[PDB]
Amino acid sequence: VARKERGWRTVFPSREFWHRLRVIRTQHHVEALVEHQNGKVVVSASTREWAIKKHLYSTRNVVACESIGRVLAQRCLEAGINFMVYQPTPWEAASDSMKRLQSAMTEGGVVLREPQRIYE
Amino acid sequence: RRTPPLGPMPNSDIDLSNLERLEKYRSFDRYRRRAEQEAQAPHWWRTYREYFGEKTDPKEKIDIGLPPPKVSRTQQLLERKQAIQELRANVEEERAARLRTASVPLDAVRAEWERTCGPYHKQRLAEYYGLYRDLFHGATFVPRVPLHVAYAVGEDDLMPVYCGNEVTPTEAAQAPEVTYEAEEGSLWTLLL
Amino acid sequence: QTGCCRNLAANDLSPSRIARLQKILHSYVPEEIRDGNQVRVTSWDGRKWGELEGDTYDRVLVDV
Amino acid sequence: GSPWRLLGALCLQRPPVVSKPLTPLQEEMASLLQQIEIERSLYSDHELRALDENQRLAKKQDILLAQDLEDMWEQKFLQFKLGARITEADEKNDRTSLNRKLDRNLVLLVREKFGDQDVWILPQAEWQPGETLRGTAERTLATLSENNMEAKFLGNAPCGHYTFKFPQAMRTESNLGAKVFFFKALLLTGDFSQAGNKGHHVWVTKDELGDYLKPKYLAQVRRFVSDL
Amino acid sequence: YKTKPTHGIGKYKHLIKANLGTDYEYGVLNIHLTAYDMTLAESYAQYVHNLCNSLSIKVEESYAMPTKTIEVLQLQDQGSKMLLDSVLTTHERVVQISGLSATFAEIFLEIIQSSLPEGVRLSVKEHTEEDFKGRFKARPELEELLAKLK
Amino acid sequence: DSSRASLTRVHRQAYARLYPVLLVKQDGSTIHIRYREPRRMLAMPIDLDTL
Amino acid sequence: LDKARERPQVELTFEETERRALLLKKWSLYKQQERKMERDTIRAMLEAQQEALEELQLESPKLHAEAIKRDPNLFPFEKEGPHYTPPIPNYQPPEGRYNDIT
RNA sequence: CAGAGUGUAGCUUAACACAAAGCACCCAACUUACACUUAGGAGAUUUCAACUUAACUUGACCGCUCUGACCA
């Protein structure tokens, strides 16, 4: 029943959500962020931490991206977050690493679509 | 009538003389990353954060938690670099990484996560729910000692409570199981 | 129809005549050829083409 | 005037005549490129020729077969002898002949006598009024003993500088020191005569350039001399 | 608003772009790469195109020249009639650069000739006088040019 | 170095097989090129007209 | 366009695929050093060239302006690639004829 | 040769600690080529100590630069 920040039809990305799955992949490390619409970050999962780095041969491969999603999906259930939006670019959507990250979140119990707001 | 600006112009630093010999973005992603950085910077003009961003006091929120543990960075880094080389030494790990068949154990990662950066993530997660805002009126504390609380449902199942997970009152009808790592002779106080 | 022209510059001063040209090309020539810059349909004075584009085209057809 | 003498040096270099041999890692990659190329290419006119003949011969007017034609080409190649990539001068270590080290670039060195002592340096000539600094470097070729060579000068700016001072013996207010400017050029064609070779000049690479040059002089030359 | 101190914050066209060779720089250079192997000619032009960008040198255009087919005829054994032996195809690649300093020309020329593979010919000629730079123009490009005259 | 960009392959989707062959010039020099047939060496003859 | 020129695609063994895969990763590092050496080579030439010009300007300002000017005689510049074998001093090529198709 | 100065892979006033980061660079695919993107690769604290967190502070050691000496 909480209102979503609708609008921003002429800019990307949109704002009509409560939580947004934002993935930041750098030259060496890959970081996935789950943040609220207000800008506050809910939970984070990145390859920079020693917890995941010690189990990854490479932090910049497809395996690292899939591994971040599996770890993040477990943390999303712990945090109580079950629904979030994913807003990738057309080339990022076609990328193989992002496809496995989406599968990891879905297999982790997280739905990549938020339910529509109830107005009445 | 023209009024001089109250501050530097957004694109004033760019030199228009040698415009042809300047590196361009050449991509959408490069501009987006630069666009996000400036959107998080204060400006002298009216901005979205001014009307919609959550106002915060200039005073830094005080800390009432335990002092941080003392860790030797040089010794800690030395072991990590050696472990990576040994992991990269094995050709099976590279083949699994190249064939995209490898995976990480979630339980082992969380156990190491719970001790290294678990308290810091929980503190940030607690702030989202406004626990520090309500319980301590904004005062924050790092949960240095992890707390394990789980409710006994039936005789074999357990419902752990990590941070804000959904728990029904039926599962919370009785006192849960409370465990934590502590030294002998110390005194503690539980609160719900 | 010849298919020998990679880039075309069709200019007529009257927009009404130009609008007829677009419909004729649309009805006959498939959109894929007209999709790119291969066919450029503009409505300007032909006297400008003697200065704006000098020595650009090898074959010029002038029906005044 | 100034107490520093202007000398126009010249850096004549011989471009490689033969390609540098491939490294062991390059050999594996080059063979890989050929193997990938075959697997992603269609049958040629000759490969289709072999298939047609084999099917026809299996059932049973082409006089020359595909396999027979390949044999003729192989025999002709064996009769032809390739030129020696490693020349006799490399075996003899004769650093005066351009035929040596065709794979690597060569640097010309001439031995001149200063202060009753022989020092190997690049050819150089003192600058003169009413002449460009580059033009003095071109004059160095004319001063060479019995040389018939054509050099291609690249640009007009000097490629380096070396500074030295007299060892308190010839040091004077009018003559305090000198500054040499290095001009690089490419040896298109020609070579020196057979009158004098060993004591006159040598041709050495960058790796073996330190044997003749001084430690201070070698440092300034290795900056504008590459070893690619 | 114009009277507001934040006037002009949305201006962007002054950050967007709307040949003569001086005595210090070379105006137009055409780097012709002739080789009988098509892969070698394409690869060297690709290396030069990457090299020019790394050195902050503008590349105007990268294109190819029409293939020239040359038949090789050899005298028959103990005869007088010419017989076909082989056919060689001549491939040429052109990389056009502009904005090269006179001082940097010596360094650039040495780098390319050192990296020139076997069987590939290097040919750089000053073709700025030839001009004939007839290129098809897009509508947004052409519209701005007409507005200047109007 | 001449090997800066010499080691390459055919960048075509459809093409016939090519072989590494030697091209003997009018001065005896040889270069490596690609020929349709597996002829290990080729020698360019001197033209009679250019005399 | 005929499909009769197509060749059968023989399956690649795991050892062959492993050999190719490990070869490409080592080839990427090999080419990185060649660029690094070439990058430093250009800088070494450029740094010495600029410093030499500075010394020439103080010694003679007029000669400094003459060197920095362009060289019209430099272009056009022609250069041929290396060969596989050195030219034979005593070689008589066979007779022949050339025909050009355009 | 001393004399001063200086020090994280190319760059950075990145490095509170949870961690040695970001960018640039390198290969391949795609492109005539570039660029974009995808898929991959290589990386650094000069070295030892100081009550310890110390890439950070103090010297020592060590690596470069700079002015004279030395110099053809």
Residue type, C57: Y
Q: How far is CA D221 from the centre of its chain?
A: 16
- Per-residue HEC secondary structure of chain D comes to CCCEEEEEEEEEEECCCECCCCCHHHHHHHHHHHHHHHHCCECCHHHHHHHHHHHHHHHCCCCCCHHHHHHHHHHHHHHCCCCCCCCHHHHHCCCCCCCCCCCCCEEEEEEEECCCCEEEECCEEECCCCCCHHHHHHHHHHHCCCEEEEEEECCCCCCCEEEEECCCCCCCCCCCEEEEEEEEEEEEEEEECCCCCCCCEEEECCCCHHHCCCHHHHHHHHHHCCCC
The CA–C1' separation of E18 and H41, in angstroms, is 40
- φ and ψ of D80, to 5 deg: -80, 135
Interface membership of E147 toward C (CB under 8 Å)? no
G87 touches chain D (CB under 8 A): yes
Contact list in F for residue E70 (CB cut-off 8 A) is none
Q: Are E100 and E25 in contact (CB under 8 A)?
A: yes
Instruction: Report DSSP letters for B11-23, one per residue.
Output: TSSS-STTGGGS-
From the CA of F11, how many Å to the nearest CA of chain G? 17
CA distance B126 to B141: 10
Helix axes D24-39, G14-59, angle to 10 degrees: 120
Helix (H, G, I), strand (E, B) or coil at E4: coil
- Residue B27 phi, psi dihedral angles, 5° rounding: -155, 160
Per the document, the length of chain D is 228
What nucleotide is nearest E46 when CA is compared to C1'?
H33
Measure G47 CA to H7 C1' (Å): 22
* Closest among E78, E49, E73, E75 to E63, alpha carbons compared: E49
In angstroms, the CA of B73 and the C1' of H57 are apart by: 16
Helices (H) and strands (E) in chain A, counts: 4, 4
* Three-state secondary structure string covering F18-35: CEEEEEECCCCCEEEEEE
Residues 10-29 of F with CB under 8 A from D: 10, 14-18, 20, 22, 24, 28-29
Tokens of B129: 């729910």
Which residues does chain B have within 8 Å of residue A4's beta carbon, measured at their own beta carbons? none
Using an 8 Å Cβ cutoff, are E117 and C21 in contact?
Answer: no
Strand H closer than 7 Å to the CB of B73?
A: yes
Q: Is F12 helix (H, G, I), strand (E, B) or coil?
A: coil
Question: Which residues of chain D does F29 touch, with a Cβ-Cβ cutoff of 8 Å?
Answer: 83
Q: What is the CATH number of the domain that holds F39?
A: 6.20.130.20
E strand or H helix that includes residue E125: strand E120-125
- Going by C-beta distance under 8 Å and a sequence separation of 6 or more, which residues neighbour residue D190? D147, D148, D149, D150
Residue labelled with tokens 């990457």: E50
Range of the domain at F16: 1-45
Which nucleotide shows the minimum CA-to-C1' distance to residue E61?
A: H33
CA distance B42 to B23: 26
Sheet holding A30-36, edge to edge: A41-46, A30-36, A19-25, A85-86
Establish whether C17 is an annotated binding residue: yes
Q: Do G97 and F45 touch (CB under 8 A)?
A: yes
Is D228's CB within 8 Å of G51's CB? no
Q: Is G59 in contact with D41 (Cβ distance < 8 A)? A: no
Cα–Cα distance, A13 to D17 (Å, whole number): 59
| Alpha-carbon dihedral sign for residues B120, B124, B127, B131 | negative
Instruction: Tell me which H or E stretch contains A65.
Output: helix A62-79
Q: d(Cα D69, Cα D47) in Å, to the nearest integer?
A: 12
Answer yes or no: are the C-beta atoms of A114 and A16 closer than 8 Å: no
Length of chain G counted residue by residue:
102
List the B68 CA – H16 C1' distance (angstroms): 12
Phi, psi (5° rounding) for residue E8?
80, 5
Q: Which residues of F touch G87 (CB under 8 A)?
A: 25, 27-29
Binding partners of C (≥3 Cβ pairs within 8 A): E
Q: Which chain B residues are within 8 Å of A42, Cβ to Cβ?
A: 125, 128
In whole angstroms, what is the distance from residue E54 CA to residue E64 CA? 22
For tokens 């204060």, what's the residue?
A: B42
Q: What is the CA radius of gyration of chain D?
A: 27
Which of the 8 DSSP states describes residue F3?
Answer: G
Q: Which nucleotide is nearest to A62 (CA to C1')?
A: H39
- Specify the CATH number for the domain of residue A86: 3.30.420.80
CB contacts of G82 in chain F (<8 Å) are 2
Of E22, D71, B112, nearest in space to G69 by CA = E22
Report how far residue E113's alpha carbon sits from residue F29's, in angstroms, rounded to the nearest whole number. 19
Pick from E40, E45, E20, E51: which is nearest to E30 by CA?
Answer: E45
Measured CA to C1', what is the nucleotide nearest B70? H53
**Segments in chain E forming alpha helices (H):** 38-54, 102-114, 139-149
- Phi, psi (rounded to 5 degrees) for G56: -65, -35
d(CA D102, CA D37): 31
Contacts of C54 in chain E (CB under 8 A): 134
- Confirm whether any atom of chain H, the nucleic acid strand, is less than 7 Å from CB of D22: no
- SS3 call for A70: helix
Cα angle E116-E122-E124, degrees, rounded to a multiple of 5 = 135
Domains contained in chain G, number: 1
- Which tokens is B173 given? 């009808």
Q: In total, how many domains does chain A have?
A: 1
Helix axis angle, A96-107 to A62-79, nearest 10° = 30
Residue E40: strand, helix, or coil: helix
Is the CB of E62 within 7 Å of strand H?
A: yes
CA dist A79 and E28 (Å) reads: 63
What does residue B70 show for φ and ψ, rounded to 5 degrees?
-95, 120
How many angstroms from the chain centroid is the CA of residue D38? 36
Radius of gyration of chain F (CA): 14
Interface of D with E (CB under 8 A): 15, 18-19, 105, 154-157, 159, 184, 186, 226, 228
Resolved by: cryo-EM
* Burial grade of E64 (CB within 10 A; 0-12, 13-18, 19 or more): middle
The DSSP string of chain C is -----SSEEEE-S-HHHHHHHHHHHHHHS-HHHHHSTTEEEE---GGGHHHHSSS--S------
Nearest to C34 by CA among C43, C45, C23, C18: C23
Q: Give the angle subtended at the CA of A16 by the CAs of A11 and A20, to the nearest 5°.
A: 95
CB E114, CB D106: distance < 8 Å = no
Instruction: State the fold for domain D94-227.
Output: Nucleoside Triphosphate Pyrophosphohydrolase (3.90.79)
Across the F/G interface, how many CB contacts are shorter than 8 Å?
49
Q: Is the CB of D222 under 7 A from strand H?
A: no
C39 and C31 in contact (C-beta within 8 Å)?
no
- For residues G95 and E75, the answer to whether their CB atoms sit within 8 Å is yes
Q: Which residue of F has its CA nearest to G97?
A: F47
* A22 φ, ψ (degrees, to nearest 5): -115, 125
Provide the residue range defining the domain that includes G80. 1-87
Question: Which bases along strand H come within 7 Å of a protein CB atom?
Answer: 17-43, 45, 52-56, 69-72
Question: Is D8:D182 a contact under the CB 8 Å cutoff?
Answer: no
B88: chain A residues, CB-CB within 8 Å = 57
Q: What whole-number distance in Å separates Cα of residue A63 and Cα of residue A69?
A: 10
The reply to whether G35 touches chain D by the CB within 8 Å rule is: no
Residue F50, chain D, CB below 8 Å: the answer is no
The CB density around residue B105, as the number of other CB atoms within 10 Å, is 10
Amino acid identity of residue B165, one-letter, is: N
The Cα angle at residue E69 between residues E73 and F21, in degrees rounded to 5: 70
Answer whether C53 sits within 8 Å of E134, measured CB to CB. yes
Contacts of A34 (CB under 8 A, 6+ apart): A19, A20, A21, A22, A41, A42, A43, A44, A72, A76, A79, A81, A84
Phi-psi region of D146 (alpha: psi -120 to 50; beta: other; left: phi over 0): left
Residue entry with tokens 């941070």: B163
Q: State whether the beta carbon of B30 lies below 7 angstroms from any atom of strand H.
A: yes
For B61-117, the DSSP string reads PPB-SPPPPP--HHHHHHHHHHHHHHHHH-HHHHHHHHTT-----HHHHHHHHHHHT
What is the Cα A36 distance to its own chain's centre?
11
CA dihedral (B22, B23, B29, B35) positive or negative: negative
Q: At what angle do helices B118-128 and B106-116 cross, to 10 degrees?
A: 80
Q: Find the radius of gyration of the CA atoms of chain B.
A: 26
Q: Say how far apart CA G96 and CA A87 lie, in whole Å.
A: 69
Shortest CA distance to G4 belongs to which of F36, F15, F12, D42?
D42
Using the Cα atoms of residue D128, residue D132, residue D133 and residue D137 in order, give the sign of their dihedral: negative
| Closest CA of chain E from D154, distance in Å | 5
Question: Is-contact D8 D124, C-beta < 8 A?
Answer: yes
B181: its two tokens: 């790592």
User: Which of F3, F6, F40 best tests the E interface by mutation, with the highest count of E CBs <10 A?
Assistant: F6
- Alpha-carbon distance C28 to B38, whole Å? 51
| Structure token digits, residue E44 | 């060297």
Question: Does B26 lie at the interface with E, CB-CB under 8 angstroms?
Answer: no
- Find where tokens 């003859």 sit: F45
- Helix or strand or coil: residue E62? strand
Residue G89: how many other CB atoms lie within 10 Å: 8
Instruction: Provide long-range contacts, Cβ within 8 A and 24+ apart, for D42-46.
Output: D42/F14, D42/F15, D42/F16, D42/F17, D42/G5, D42/G6, D42/G7, D43/F16, D43/F17, D43/G4, D43/G5, D43/G6, D43/G7, D44/F16, D44/F17, D44/F36, D44/F37, D45/F16, D45/F36, D46/F36, D46/F37, D46/F38
Edge-first strand listing for the sheet containing F19-24? F30-35, F19-24, F41-43
CA pair distance A101, A69, nearest whole angstrom = 5
Q: Subunits that touch chain B (at least 3 Cβ pairs < 8 angstroms)?
A: A, E
Per residue in B161-171, is it b (16+ CB within 10 Å) or e — as a string?
A: bbbbeeeeeeb
Q: Does C55 carry a binding-site annotation?
A: no
Q: Which are the contacts of F35, defined by CB distance < 8 A and separation ≥ 6?
A: E86, F18, F19, F21, F42
CA B88 – CA D101 distance, rounded (Å): 42
Mutation choice for G interface testing from D133, D153, D162 by most G CBs within 10 A: D133
Within 13 Å and on the Cβ side, how many CA atoms surround E102? 21
Q: How many domains does chain F have?
A: 1
- Residues on chain C touching E148 (C-beta within 8 angstroms): none
For chain G, which chains pass the contact test of at least 3 CB pairs under 8 Å? D, E, F
Interchain proximity A42–B125, CB inside 8 Å: yes
Tokens of F22: 């030697």
From the alpha carbon of B121, which nucleotide's C1' atom is closest? Answer: H18
The residue in chain G having the minimum alpha-carbon distance to the alpha carbon of residue D38 is G7
Helix pair A62-79, B106-116: axis angle to 10 deg: 70
Radius of gyration of chain E (CA): 23
Question: Is A14 in the B-facing interface, judged by CB distances under 8 Å?
Answer: no
* Token pair belonging to D217: 């002089």
Minimal CA separation from G14 to chain E, in Å: 30
Out of G39, G72, G101, name the one closest to residue E71 (CB). Answer: G101
Q: Would the CA dihedral through F29, F31, F37, F40 be positive or negative?
A: positive
Cβ within 8 Å, pair F41-D80: yes
Q: Amino acid identity of A115?
A: P
Q: Which of B50, B28, B59 is nearest to B140 (CA)?
A: B59
Q: What is the full DSSP assignment across E87-120?
A: EEEEEEEEEEEE-EEHHHHHHHHHHHHHTPPTTE
Among chain E residues, the shortest Cα distance to D157 is held by E103
Token pair for B31? 């501009």
Whether the CB-CB separation of C5 and C39 falls below 8 Å is answered with no
